[PDB]
Amino acid sequence: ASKRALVILAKGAEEMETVIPVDVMRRAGIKVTVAGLAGKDPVQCSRDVVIAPDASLEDAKKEGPYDVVVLPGGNLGAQNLSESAAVKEILKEQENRKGLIAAICAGPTALLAHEIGFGSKVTTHPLAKDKMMNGGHYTYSENRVEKDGLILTSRGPGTSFEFALAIVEALNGKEVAAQVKAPLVLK
Amino acid sequence: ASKRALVILAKGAEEMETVIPVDVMRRAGIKVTVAGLAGKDPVQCSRDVVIAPDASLEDAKKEGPYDVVVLPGGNLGAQNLSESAAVKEILKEQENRKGLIAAICAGPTALLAHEIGFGSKVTTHPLAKDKMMNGGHYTYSENRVEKDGLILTSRGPGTSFEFALAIVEALNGKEVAAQVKAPLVLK
């Protein structure tokens, strides 16, 4: 049985932080569902790339559970994720079943909004640190990718490959991650 | 006046090699037109990400000239670019007006198909080297990004940021490229 991933795509998401993890997870043989927060319609990302989701979140959330729930960044995308009751329920359920939650850039601020994984070490984009740290509910890290148990976080577009390969390693193991990495021509 | 870029998007294109340059060029204030080879409809990329183009190539090609023409990779995407008479005309015109042509991964094999920039140093994805070198019309380089005059090439998904920043440097200068680079959190 293949592992499954839910990637939640909201208006204003950073398109690089969305596409790199989707592509790399699919290279690892993970069944990835790109789910539109607002519905089935294509989504306008932060730099105006328009991506058509595989499903609405409304539909996708009924087809769980998932081995990982992925939250892309982008300031406005993360704000939309943070305001969503559906996202809150999905993340609480994932936390309760001890499943992986992965968030990049401004994405981890949605964990704060929904009170997920308090007491974890986390990283974010440098510009999102103050928002994430409001109330002191996490301990901040400057690592490019941070993993504290089931909370996996990362910093920005330039850490997206490292973030995605960390998800692959967590789900399918180090060897699969190494095999997927090689053809990418990373430095 | 802002610089303009034409990104030609074909079925089977590598979505990371498409989105990273579009996003980074837009961060640099370049007016980027994502043009669908087959028309106006959304395009299914190599790893099944679906991207809606800004225009058909048929329309976009009448709105030139462009300061750069960008060819993403992906084996099947590059094959589609290589078979296109419209792409041939655009590239020949760009070469004739001494404008920049940028191609990544398998993308440079479309230069060979259309007889563009013979005698240049080029790079490609390692797996595309033999196709690119058929006939010995280029000199092969293992640099992560290669630039020989107006022909700019690169190797793969993991060199996409370097490729995009090289386009920005060529069009808008080193300082703009450095300013765009900093918030990306690259290593």
Side-chain angles (χ1 to χ4, degrees):
Chain A
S2 302
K3 302 285 180 190
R4 306 172 69 217
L6 177 67
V7 176
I8 309 181
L9 179 57
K11 187 175 176 59
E14 224 297 326
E15 44 269 77
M16 299 184 286
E17 295 170 16
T18 302
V19 171
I20 292 163
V22 170
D23 184 319
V24 171
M25 288 189 292
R26 286 183 174 149
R27 286 170 179 259
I30 297 168
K31 298 181 61 171
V32 180
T33 299
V34 182
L37 182 63
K40 308 173 157 66
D41 291 343
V43 178
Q44 186 184 1
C45 295
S46 66
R47 273 67 185 180
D48 279 348
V49 174
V50 173
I51 297 173
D54 301 316
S56 65
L57 186 60
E58 182 174 341
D59 289 339
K61 75 185 184 188
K62 298 174 185 178
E63 303 292 336
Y66 296 89
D67 299 284
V68 62
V69 176
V70 181
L71 308 183
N75 183 27
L76 299 192
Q79 290 180 35
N80 287 320
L81 298 172
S82 293
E83 297 172 353
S84 168
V87 173
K88 186 185 309 292
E89 295 183 5
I90 289 164
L91 294 176
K92 295 282 190 182
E93 175 174 345
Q94 186 72 343
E95 197 182 25
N96 285 338
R97 65 187 290 280
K98 301 176 187 174
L100 187 66
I101 297 173
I104 179 161
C105 183
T109 64
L111 306 179
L112 174 58
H114 299 310
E115 301 187 338
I116 304 296
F118 284 3
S120 298
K121 259 70 72 168
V122 301
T123 192
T124 68
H125 193 278
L127 297 170
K129 175 180 181 172
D130 288 351
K131 180 179 269 288
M132 187 69 175
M133 288 297 292
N134 185 19
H137 297 291
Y138 305 94
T139 297
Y140 201 76
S141 170
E142 290 175 16
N143 285 325
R144 294 175 62 77
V145 177
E146 189 55 73
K147 189 176 182 293
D148 198 356
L150 300 159
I151 301 290
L152 182 47
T153 55
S154 193
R155 310 204 81 185
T159 66
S160 291
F161 284 102
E162 292 154 89
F163 172 72
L165 289 165
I167 295 169
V168 172
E169 180 168 342
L171 295 190
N172 292 347
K174 289 179 181 285
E175 187 185 22
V176 171
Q179 294 166 345
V180 168
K181 183 180 181 182
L184 300 176
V185 193
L186 289 162
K187 194 173 191 175
Chain B
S2 302
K3 302 285 180 190
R4 306 172 69 217
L6 177 67
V7 176
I8 309 181
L9 179 57
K11 187 175 176 59
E14 224 297 326
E15 44 269 77
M16 299 184 286
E17 295 170 16
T18 302
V19 171
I20 292 163
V22 170
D23 184 319
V24 171
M25 288 189 292
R26 286 183 174 149
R27 286 169 179 259
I30 297 168
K31 298 181 61 171
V32 180
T33 299
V34 182
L37 182 63
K40 308 173 157 66
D41 291 343
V43 178
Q44 186 184 1
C45 295
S46 66
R47 273 67 185 180
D48 279 348
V49 174
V50 173
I51 297 173
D54 301 316
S56 65
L57 186 60
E58 182 174 341
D59 289 339
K61 75 185 184 188
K62 298 174 185 178
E63 303 292 336
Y66 296 89
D67 299 284
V68 62
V69 176
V70 181
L71 308 183
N75 183 27
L76 299 192
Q79 290 180 35
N80 287 320
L81 298 172
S82 293
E83 297 172 353
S84 168
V87 173
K88 186 185 309 292
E89 295 183 5
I90 289 164
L91 294 176
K92 295 282 190 182
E93 175 174 345
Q94 186 72 343
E95 197 182 25
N96 285 338
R97 65 187 290 280
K98 301 176 187 174
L100 187 66
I101 297 173
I104 179 161
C105 183
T109 64
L111 306 179
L112 174 58
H114 299 310
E115 301 187 338
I116 304 296
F118 284 3
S120 298
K121 259 70 72 168
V122 301
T123 192
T124 68
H125 193 278
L127 297 170
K129 175 180 181 172
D130 288 351
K131 180 179 269 288
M132 187 69 175
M133 288 297 292
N134 185 19
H137 297 291
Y138 305 94
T139 297
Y140 201 76
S141 170
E142 290 175 16
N143 285 325
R144 294 175 62 77
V145 177
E146 189 55 73
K147 189 176 182 293
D148 198 356
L150 300 159
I151 301 290
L152 182 47
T153 55
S154 193
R155 310 204 81 185
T159 66
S160 291
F161 284 102
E162 292 154 89
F163 172 72
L165 289 165
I167 295 169
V168 172
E169 180 168 342
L171 295 190
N172 292 347
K174 289 179 181 285
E175 187 185 22
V176 171
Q179 294 166 345
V180 168
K181 183 180 181 182
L184 300 176
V185 193
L186 289 162
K187 194 173 191 175

